[PDB]
Amino acid sequence: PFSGLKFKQNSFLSTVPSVTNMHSMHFDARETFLGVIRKALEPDTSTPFPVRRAFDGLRAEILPNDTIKSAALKAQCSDIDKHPELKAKMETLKEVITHHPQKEKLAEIALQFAREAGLTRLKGETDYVLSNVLDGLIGDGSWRAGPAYESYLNKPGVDRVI
Amino acid sequence: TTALVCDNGSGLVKAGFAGDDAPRAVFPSIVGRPRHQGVMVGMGQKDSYVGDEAQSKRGILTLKYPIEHGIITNWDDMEKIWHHTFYNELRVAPEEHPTLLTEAPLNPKANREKMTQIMFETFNVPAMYVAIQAVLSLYASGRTTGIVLDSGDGVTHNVPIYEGYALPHAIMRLDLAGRDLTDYLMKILTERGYSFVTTAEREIVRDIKEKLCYVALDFENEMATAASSSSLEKSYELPDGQVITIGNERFRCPETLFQPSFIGMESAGIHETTYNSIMKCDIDIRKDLYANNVMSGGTTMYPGIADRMQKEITALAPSTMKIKIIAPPERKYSVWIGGSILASLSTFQQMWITKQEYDEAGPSIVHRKCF
Amino acid sequence: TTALVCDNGSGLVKAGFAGDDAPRAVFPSIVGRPRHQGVMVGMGQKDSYVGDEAQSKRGILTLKYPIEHGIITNWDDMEKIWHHTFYNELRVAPEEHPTLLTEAPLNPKANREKMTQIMFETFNVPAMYVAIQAVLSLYASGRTTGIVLDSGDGVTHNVPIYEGYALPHAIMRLDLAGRDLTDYLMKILTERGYSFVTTAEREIVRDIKEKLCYVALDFENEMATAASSSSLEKSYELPDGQVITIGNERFRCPETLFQPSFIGMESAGIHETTYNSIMKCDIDIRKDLYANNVMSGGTTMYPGIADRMQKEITALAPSTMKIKIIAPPERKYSVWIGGSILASLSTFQQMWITKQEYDEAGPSIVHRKCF
Amino acid sequence: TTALVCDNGSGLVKAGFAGDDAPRAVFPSIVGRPRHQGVMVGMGQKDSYVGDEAQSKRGILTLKYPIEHGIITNWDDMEKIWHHTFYNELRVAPEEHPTLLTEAPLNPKANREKMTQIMFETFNVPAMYVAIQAVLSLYASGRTTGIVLDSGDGVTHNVPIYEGYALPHAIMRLDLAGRDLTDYLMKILTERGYSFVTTAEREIVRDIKEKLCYVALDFENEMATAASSSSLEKSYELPDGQVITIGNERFRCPETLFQPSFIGMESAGIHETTYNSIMKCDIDIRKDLYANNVMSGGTTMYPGIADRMQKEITALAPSTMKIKIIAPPERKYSVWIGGSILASLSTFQQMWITKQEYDEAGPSIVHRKCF
Ligand SMILES: Nc1ncnc2c1ncn2[C@@H]1O[C@H](COP(=O)(O)OP(=O)(O)O)[C@@H](O)[C@H]1O
Ligand SMILES: Nc1ncnc2c1ncn2[C@@H]1O[C@H](COP(=O)(O)OP(=O)(O)O)[C@@H](O)[C@H]1O
Numbered sequence A: 001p002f003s004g005l006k007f008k009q010n011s012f013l014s015t016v017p018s019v020t021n022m023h024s025m026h027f028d029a030r031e032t033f034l035g036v037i038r039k040a041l042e043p044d045t046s047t048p049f050p051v052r053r054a055f056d057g058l059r060a061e062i063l064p065n066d067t068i069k070s071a072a073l074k075a076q077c078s079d080i081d082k083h084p085e086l087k088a089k090m091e092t093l094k095e096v097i098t099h100h101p102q103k104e105k106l107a108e109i110a111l112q113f114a115r116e117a118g119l120t121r122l123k124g125e126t127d128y129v130l131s132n133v134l135d136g137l138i139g140d141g142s143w144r145a146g147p148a149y150e151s152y153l154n155k156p157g158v159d160r161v162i
Numbered sequence B, C, D: 001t002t003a004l005v006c007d008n009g010s011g012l013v014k015a016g017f018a019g020d021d022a023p024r025a026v027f028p029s030i031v032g033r034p035r036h037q038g039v040m041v042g043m044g045q046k047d048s049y050v051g052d053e054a055q056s057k058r059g060i061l062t063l064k065y066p067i068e069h070g071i072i073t074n075w076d077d078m079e080k081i082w083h084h085t086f087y088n089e090l091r092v093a094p095e096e097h098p099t100l101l102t103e104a105p106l107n108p109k110a111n112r113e114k115m116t117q118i119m120f121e122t123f124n125v126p127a128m129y130v131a132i133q134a135v136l137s138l139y140a141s142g143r144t145t146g147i148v149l150d151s152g153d154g155v156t157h158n159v160p161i162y163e164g165y166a167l168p169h170a171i172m173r174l175d176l177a178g179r180d181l182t183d184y185l186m187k188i189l190t191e192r193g194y195s196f197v198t199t200a201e202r203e204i205v206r207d208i209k210e211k212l213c214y215v216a217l218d219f220e221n222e223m224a225t226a227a228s229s230s231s232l233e234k235s236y237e238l239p240d241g242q243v244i245t246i247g248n249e250r251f252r253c254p255e256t257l258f259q260p261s262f263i264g265m266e267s268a269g270i271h272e273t274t275y276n277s278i279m280k281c282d283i284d285i286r287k288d289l290y291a292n293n294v295m296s297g298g299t300t301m302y303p304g305i306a307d308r309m310q311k312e313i314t315a316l317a318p319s320t321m322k323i324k325i326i327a328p329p330e331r332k333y334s335v336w337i338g339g340s341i342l343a344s345l346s347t348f349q350q351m352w353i354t355k356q357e358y359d360e361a362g363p364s365i366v367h368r369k370c371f
């Protein structure tokens, strides 16, 4: 449905923050991961116009720029059944990011935001956008468990070593 | 009622009202995300500094520019800087005053189409207009003819223009500019060991450059003065306190404008692409372009740049007739000031791009408004 | 309702409620078993004294510390001391009030993982939080920037931090601290014959140290004053009655902070690992770290320690710009007081580690809470 | 008659004769003073050990490196190590054989000027020559084109070069290298409690690093293997006897080459500054640079480093065309072996820097010998 549309390569490398940045306690990882997905889905100008402004027109009510619009976006994410026409337009974007040409480089960095920044600390209770965008990049959706484990205690030998 | 004029500078966003002599606020075009822990609980907010507050706090930020080479790249950040212009530092409602964006010639179309689409559908300004950089600078001259060496932070370009009429085929444009100066100055400080690596130090390299670097009148004979290095070196205090000094690297950096092979780009220097522009122009105008050369843009605030190109174009011109280099003392703001004039003309209020004619036109309306 | 803050001191456990100015109870972190016959029949009970009652009864006990080098070693005794805090001296139910443990940076992970597992599965506190030592001490400063020479009884460490944001790679940490002072003071009392051998005498060495030892402004020139030994010596009454005196050993002991080769550890002194931390920090912050150096921790209560490091960092800094040493008169309690502030902030009650989120997380939850 | 080639390694001095396949002697670039009493009367001599004898005796020495970041700092010690090369381990008279020093690109000029002045006016060699590191490594390839990821102990750098001709403006250089790996490995051993503090332990950290650390193919998915920590951990016997073990810290340390934000330096990884170098090169050469990527230097002996960057540059390149990573099995000695070739060419004996042309030239002669 959005055929004839493409993106420029490596469009998001300036946007992904440092690892010491995302180890912050005042780091609301939602609006900076979406801000990566916003920049990563910036359509290349080689796409023709009538598919460009439609796909951009789908974006502004899905991935807004202002911090009050995305905070307003989460408000209907609690009752996504009662908002079908925006909920139905979301899986279109999920279909687009499924065929994204740098999907693996996204999917490598997408769950790098999940562990180091704690993006997926709800694990099944995250809202509708962070659910399917990760499910757009991670096919099996196996991100539910796995970042929580960190191999806490094991001492196969001697005590403190000096 | 009044109009705003806001030169989208590649390095320094210059902005202000129409009819004002000086631009109201000039701040560097820097957006910056922080890059560290933030173990404080209160000061961890404001996750993206922009402008002067990113300039002062530059030690903990990854300073990135939204515009490179005159082409607006990061449109998400470019909203953030324009929101900082209108609300945060001009304190004006953008929906009430008309704006006037400015841009370089020969940039991509989508740099212009997105720029108007992000102006109406985000800021809802009543009317806008996009101007070529150098054709504003003749309004700053108060003179209707002559080419312009408009060298900015991101791009340099020549727009030859006779009285009224421009020469669109003879517009030449080189991407060598102040960032390519700054990046080459970073390369040659390492020869003296002053290794300045990251973006915070890339900022203070420009403070070295704008305070110290002059361009030489005769490059080789003044290089030979640096052989008997007696009085060439000055010395600059870094923000930490330790001091540097710099010798032949002080003038060898702005010779990139004249020998672009120093940064290895295969081109003619800005003295020669001047003459290559005037040779492209028709033969009657060439007498008047030689008498009318407007230096413009903040890169051309190097001391000695007027005395150099007046010498060097004379080497290329036929020597039977005179050359002039019109270098005013307001070259840094010349694009804005000419932009401040053009919005104030009574014959201009029909030349805008209104919203009521935008809505049936779409973003291609600016291509039928002065190309 | 209210929270408890209990700094797990390496030498002195400091504890109290949130929002209180002074910590409620400060007692030395000493557990001690008796070591003799006990031929009395009634007084033979209470086979492990801890805290002040181990301090007064120190002559018949083997006084051992549960924490060495900031690392909690004997977890069996570490329960016994925390049970003494909550029940025996604060008289509060731990199941009702939230706690806030504090710890050094760069300690092992199991020092943190066991500490939370022994907090929930033993004391059943509602919510806990673990804080880095020195980042609490800036809350005691009421100032959001500057490195901290937080030298405790067991470890010293520097946490450089700009406004909000810390520098995790530039955190430096040396194990030289007050016990390494005390052990070296025991070595140099033997040069005057005052052989203090075992742990009861190791306690009274610290009473010699905290009452007498000052650090010299200029080490060699004030050593030469001890050559003409006229007014340097003071004299200290031991608990039995016989009196000692001490000369050049009074200031030569706290020079271990500056010459760590005295105890033979190959390191830079705390004046130099200060500067080595600030050189690791980025170049913009260095101007502000030099103006903001917070002495903290009980080891830095030596008289003259501020006048020394202000002199000595000045020897290492570029002399064109100023240095400051922020040494408040509450440095002994600065980690607690800043800990008392941080628990009292209204923006902090979402930053805890609750039990209801612990149960599906396990002890690795503190690694995703401020590292 | 024959020439010597002696790669001034930032970590390991590699040396030997011209035309030899293997370098004659490889010893670590460590000078070390002792730091203790020496109450023996006979063995107190030789107050500065250097090389392998400083390596074996490393427990009583303050091991310091003369070269950091590819820049020779301590010129007094740098004489001592070169005197150890010629006399103590090669046993050759330096006045008879020509030498060939090697160095990194973009180092300071005084690192080159002093290096030739300390070569003639101290060792009196007949003729010398200074070579860029990576341009020697193509001679080891036997191939005349392609960029080189020459990552040493002290610096990594890319020298893109087409057949014959180099690209001087596209030479990129990052200071992240094996010492920055070693220092970060010391930071992350403390998370498992293995506190290795001083320079003797900094040596044995490198023995941990070179024997154990591999780089991961996919960082996050192989980090998730360390969550179910079953077969990742190996275990290493320290020189005292007590054994360590290491889990996710084994591969997380060489990810500093790819995420330089781990040590907090704001840069692109060596996979990306590869691609940033090739984008700087002209458009015809880019097809051949992608087919010709030479890994070189001892840092790139990590297992899996070729399989990683072949994957990761493929993520950055346009996928329509192939990539190759030329990782020979002699990458540790590739700079020497290519240096051994270049001195042996019959077309090279006019390319030296002789003493008879030095004497009227002074130390600036090397700036007119291959920059
Ligand atoms: N006084 C000065 N001396 C030398 N260089 C200067 C001076 N002022 C500005 N510059 C250079 O000019 C640049 C500013 O150009 P700018 O006005 O932003 O061009 P544009 O507005 O077209 O982007 C700065 O980046 C700086 O490098
Ligand atoms: N007034 C003082 N004068 C000198 N030294 C002191 C003084 N008070 C405490 N100290 C030293 O500081 C140590 C206490 O440090 P403390 O604040 O308990 O650190 P921590 O809480 O990290 O254990 C004691 O061992 C003592 O030697």
Ligand SMILES: Nc1ncnc2c1ncn2[C@@H]1O[C@H](COP(=O)(O)OP(=O)(O)O)[C@@H](O)[C@H]1O
Binding pocket: D007, D008, D009, D010, D011, D012, D151, D152, D153, D154, D178, D179, D206, D209, D210, D211, D297, D298, D299, D300, D301, D302, D332
């Ligand atoms: N086989 C190996 N496996 C892993 N790391 C290695 C190996 N060999 C060398 N290194 C690392 O590479 C560095 C040696 O690099 P080197 O070739 O000496 O660079 P240079 O010669 O420019 O000094 C050492 O720090 C060592 O840690």
Ligand SMILES: [Mg+2]
Binding pocket: B009, B010, B151, B152, B153, B297, B298, B335
């Ligand atoms: Mg300009």
Ligand SMILES: [Mg+2]
Binding pocket: C009, C010, C151, C152, C153, C297, C298, C335
């Ligand atoms: Mg303390």
Ligand SMILES: [Mg+2]
Binding pocket: D007, D008, D009, D010, D011, D012, D152, D153
């Ligand atoms: Mg080497």
